[PDB]
């Protein structure tokens, strides 16, 4: 089987989760520790993943948000992400997949083009954000930013749905 869908089972009672997908184990751990500092009204359950497809586990909850932390200084984070978005459903792409390109502050030692992850996000209809997780002051701005996406994808506010998040995070160049 080894497939992923965002809607198979029950979420729970005021409990959401996040699937941190990446190749670096020390960089995504500091992002996972900084999300527990900013308190909220929901129980957070951070899942750490290496590469899709995942092994068949039966104790997994309903997944609300999958972020793909790619590295701009690494092609190994991009080639595993290209194998990761083959085994996904089209219902993930209605405002539940966010991208993170790390290494955007250093424009002297970068190892993939900025237009490549824009073209990866344009044909797959995903929002693209840039942040540097090596700075502890920049990481707390990022760890604030993962919570307020997760309040939308779990449905904790009235009136704003998951496809309302896709319409606010659009990106299109000017036709003139």
């Amino acid at each position: 089987m080894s497939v992923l869908r965002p809607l198979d089972k029950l979420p729970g009672l005021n409990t959401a989760t996040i699937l941190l997908v990446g190749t670096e184990d020390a960089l995504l751990q500091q992002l996972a520790d900084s999300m527990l500092k900013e308190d909220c009204a929901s129980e957070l359950k951070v899942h750490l993943a290496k590469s899709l497809p995942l092994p068949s586990s039966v104790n997994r909850p309903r997944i609300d948000l999958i972020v793909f932390v790619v590295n701009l200084h690494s092609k190994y984070s991009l080639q595993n992400t290209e194998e990761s978005l083959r085994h996904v459903d089209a219902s993930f792409f209605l405002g539940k997949v966010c991208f993170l390109a790390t290494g955007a502050g250093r424009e002297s030692h970068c190892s993939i083009h900025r237009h490549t992850v824009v073209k990866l996000a344009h044909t797959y209809q995903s929002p693209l954000l840039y942040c540097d997780l090596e700075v502890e002051g920049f990481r707390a701005t990022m760890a604030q930013r993962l919570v307020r996406v997760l309040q939308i994808c779990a449905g904790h506010v009235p009136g704003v749905s998951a496809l309302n998040l896709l319409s606010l995070l659009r990106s299109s160049e000017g036709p003139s």
Binding site: L13, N14, A41, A154, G155, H156, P158
Partner: peptide, 13 residues
């Protein structure tokens, strides 16, 4: 205060 919990879980459901 349990009535805010009932209204918040009712709006979430």
């Amino acid at each position: 205060d349990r009535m805010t919990l009932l209204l918040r879980l009712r709006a979430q459901t």
